[PDB]
């Protein structure tokens, strides 16, 4: 699972050192850097085995609740029955193989309110208060003796979308525990280039392609307060779409520019269309 990751090798090692220590990482950054992909591959790195079972991924939304996450009382035909969630069940597998590393992926964690979801468990999931000693009876626990303890093997990864203007303030509960990590777009990198060079891409088109995007990313990142640095465009669109072996060229490029990036500029630039028209022309013209 480490053959072609466009991100520099430095950060992906930094995370692995950070992850084994803090155990609760946040990967920020614009959409289209494969936050799911890098994290999904990173999960295999920490295990070292390209095995899916230890890894699970869930997408948070505002209505995501403790009931789905951990424990709930769904009805059967006649009467209500306690139903284990994802995380609760997930840990039961991890307890079997404490030697091995089990990993939980949480996409778009910022959107939901974590507190209602984790509830009691939010204390435990931090690296320090782990093991049998910190075990607690659950909210729905009929008997106090049954307890839940976060094993050390667990490593939790969170993905947060920087792009939204709608964002105002990061949740406090998130900040106290997790180690925030910012993912640069990395549009100008060797592995992305050499991947493109291995595919039917001439260097001029590469240099043309890399040159224009950097100037665009700098422009938006430059006006930091009006628009965050995380608004700057990613690279993931250019990766996919070449599965058929199509040559990447200005003919192919112009569709992705106009189809995918153009509305993104429209949302980012809702003030001046001439300013939009200025940058769209330079990409191809």
């Amino acid at each position: 699972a480490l053959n072609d990751l466009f991100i520099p090798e430095t950060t992906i090692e930094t995370i692995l050192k950070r992850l084994t220590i803090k155990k609760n990482i946040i990967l920020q950054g614009p959409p289209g850097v494969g936050k799911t992909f890098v994290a999904r591959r990173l999960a295999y790195l920490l295990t070292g085995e390209k095995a899916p079972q230890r890894v699970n991924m869930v997408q948070f939304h505002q209505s995501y609740s403790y009931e789905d996450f951990i424990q709930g009382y769904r009805p059967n035909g006649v009467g209500f029955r306690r139903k284990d969630g994802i995380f609760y069940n997930f840990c039961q597998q991890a307890k079997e193989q404490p030697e091995k590393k089990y990993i939980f992926i949480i996409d778009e964690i910022n959107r939901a309110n974590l507190s209602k979801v984790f509830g009691e468990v939010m204390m435990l999931m931090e690296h320090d208060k782990r093991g049998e000693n910190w075990s607690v009876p659950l909210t729905y626990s009929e008997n106090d003796e049954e307890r839940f303890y976060v094993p050390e093997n667990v490593y939790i990864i969170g993905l947060m979308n920087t792009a939204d203007r709608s964002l105002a303030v990061v949740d406090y509960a998130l900040r106290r525990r997790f180690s925030f990590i910012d993912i640069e777009p990395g549009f100008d990198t060797p592995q992305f280039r050499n991947f493109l060079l291995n595919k039917k891409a001439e260097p001029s088109f590469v240099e043309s392609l890399c040159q224009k995007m950097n100037e665009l990313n700098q422009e938006i990142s430059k006006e930091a307060t009006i628009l965050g640095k995380g608004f700057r465009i990613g690279h993931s669109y250019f990766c996919c779409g070449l599965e058929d072996g199509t040559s990447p060229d200005t003919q192919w490029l112009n569709e992705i520019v106009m189809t995918d990036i153009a509305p993104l500029l429209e949302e980012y630039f809702f003030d001046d269309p001439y300013k939009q028209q200025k940058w769209t022309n330079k990409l191809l013209g």
């Binding site: 009382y73 769904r74 009805p75 209500f80 105002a168």
Partner: protein
Amino acid sequence: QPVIPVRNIYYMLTYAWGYANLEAIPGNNLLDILGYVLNKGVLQLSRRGLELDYNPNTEIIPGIKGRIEFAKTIRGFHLNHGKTVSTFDMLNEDTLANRIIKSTLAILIKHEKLNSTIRDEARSLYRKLPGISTLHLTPQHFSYLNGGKNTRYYKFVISVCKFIVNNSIPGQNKGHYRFYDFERNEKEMSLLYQKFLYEFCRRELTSANTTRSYLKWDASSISDQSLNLLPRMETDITIRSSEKILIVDAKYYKSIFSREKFHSQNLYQLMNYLWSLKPENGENIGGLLIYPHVDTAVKHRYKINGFDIGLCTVNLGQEWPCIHQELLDIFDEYLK
């Protein structure tokens, strides 16, 4: 680079918004004056009582309060853990209007250049409103309240709050604030002046009728009936009486404060307003140029192209009542 004494400016703002002793305050700068009004203004409200607007709340509680929503209750199975999804009406002061006050005060406290006593009193009140929630204010927040359900009094302080927010700039520190140099810019000062008179004249000149009059050019063009290309022309104010009609165009110019050449470029607008405007009554047509000066007031009359035109000034910085006296004297002479 002379400017108006700051205390006098507050009076024209009052007429602009259409709703006192300021000798007490010793801070000449505006924000000291303006805060004292707001800080005292809130206190006037609290004595009578602040606005309490019933906010309906739909939340999950362990019992019946108000009206139960059967659907969300069964779908969430809240009966099982002894809870209901119920709608009820908590009574708060947390409305948009009142939230603006506290959030506005935060900036007021944060302002770097301010009287300490004023900041002391404001910080007290900031604490005295615990329930209300702080906000990061925008004009859209003020925009939503243009409906104006609130009392006549509330709209006054909010109008004050609008002036502060728009005229607030961060200063030496990232958090702290520094007040805008409002007087130095002519356009807003002029736009104040143009609006000042329109609302003022309604108060005092009950004898006359005061209207802003839209005009259509006398032109016809074979190209377009629209005449969109032509400038939009809307009088600053028109003050019509049965015996005589009269138009005023007033603007603030920096050159005029120097007592030399004279800046009357706005006059060029005036004749064309007189021309396209045609009275059915045919009583009379008159025009006035009025400007603000500091030292003295001088009044002239003109008979140019069959039109009766006046140039006049007022010595702002003299005294507000004598200033009020002067204006009534001014309009009376020319109107006659």
